[PDB]
Each structure stands twice: as C-alpha cells, then as structure tokens.
Amino acid sequence: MNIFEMLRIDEGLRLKIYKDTEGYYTIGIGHLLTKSPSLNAAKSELDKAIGRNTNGVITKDEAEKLFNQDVDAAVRGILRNAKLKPVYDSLDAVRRAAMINMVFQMGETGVAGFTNSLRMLQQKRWDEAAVNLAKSRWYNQTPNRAKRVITTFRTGTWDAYK
C-alpha cells in the first residue's frame, strides 16, 4: 500500500464532473474544481486545468495526471509550511502518508489548524492524538474516511485499508 493507492480508495474515480460531500464541483480522483455554484464556472476551470475543451468529461489518463499533480502539491505544501514540516519530519513513513491524506482533503491551512493534535503527533502520543483528532467537524462530516485516517495515525500500519 502507498499514498496513491490509499487516496484512490478514499476518493474514488469519476470521469464526469460531480459534486463532493460538501456540494462542490469535483472531477477525477478528488480534484476540487471550484467552490462556486456555477457548473459553467466548473467547466471553465476544468478546461483550464486540462488544456482542452472537455465538455465536463475527462479520460482516465487525464484523471491520473491531475492526481499526480495534486499529491505532489500536497507533499510540497507540507514541506513549505512552518507548522507542518516539523511534524511530518518527525513521523514514520506510514504516518506520513496519513498526514498527506488529510492535507489533500482539507488543504494545508485546515490541517495546520489542528494545533493540539499536531503537538500530540509530534510527541508520539498516538492514542491521545486519535482521541483529539475525532473532536472535529472533519470526523463528524466524513466519519468512515476520518476513522481510517485516524487508525493509520494510531497504529502506524495500513490495517484500515486492508
């Protein structure tokens, strides 16, 4: 198991513009297009992202290309962030994947907002961090996915995904 396979299980794959759990226009493997309500603003973002007139539909390769970019940006976002980097550096490889998953889903700003949990992760207080991570809108809104991520943090293994 790896970050790509992990995120592909959590996000799924859709070749047509769809709405995410929050109601925003997305495509591919969890690629957010726009928070705007306009499907046209979504089609426009999409064409801009792909470099062609898509009419809201993309190929598997196109989906994968967006996905490769998004994982790369997520890692680089972590490494550039003063609050995130120290945590990331302190973690083992499996747990690193869990933090990348949170950032891909909620952005660097969002994760950086989990101040107390980040501190507990840095100190390697697994059980306590897992408890604190659960007291969030994140867990409340997407509980099955949050549990998987959280279990990865708690255990340091890929069990939740197997």
Residue numbering of the annotated binding site for substrate: 32, 104, 117, 132
Q: How far apart (Å, rounded) are the C-alpha atoms in residues 126 and 130?
A: 6
Q: Return d(Cα 91, Cα 119) in angstroms, integer.
A: 12
Write down the catalytic residue from 20, 47, 64, 128. Answer: 20
Instruction: Determine the Cα angle at 85 with ends 78 and 69, to 5°.
Output: 20
CA distance 75 to 161: 21
Residues 57-76 that bind Cl ion (CB under 5 A): none
Please say which residue, 29 or 87, places its beta carbon nearer to Cl ion: 29
Nearest distance from C-beta of residue 117 to Cl ion, angstroms: 19
Cβ 142 to Cl ion shortest distance, Å: 4
Which residue in the set 33, 46, 49, 150 belongs to the binding site for Cl ion (CB under 5 A)? Answer: 49
The count of residues interacting with Cl ion (CB under 5 A) is 4
List the Cα angle 82/118/143 in 5-degree steps: 125
Catalytic residue, chosen from 10, 11, 62, 70, is 11
User: What is each CA distance from 50 to 38, 62, 77, 107, 114, in whole angstroms?
Assistant: 19, 7, 22, 21, 33
Binders of Cl ion in range 107-146 (CB under 5 A): 142, 144-145
11 is catalytic: yes
The residue count of the chain comes to: 162
- Residue 123: CB minimum distance to Cl ion, A: 28
CA–CA–CA angle 49, 21, 36 (5° rounding):
50
Question: Is residue 20 annotated as a catalytic residue, yes or no?
Answer: yes
- Which is closer to Cl ion, CB of 87 or CB of 103? 103
For 27, the token pair is: 């495509």
Binding region: 32, 104, 117, 132
Catalytic residue numbers?
A: 11, 20
The residue ranges that bind Cl ion (CB under 5 A) are 49, 142, 144-145
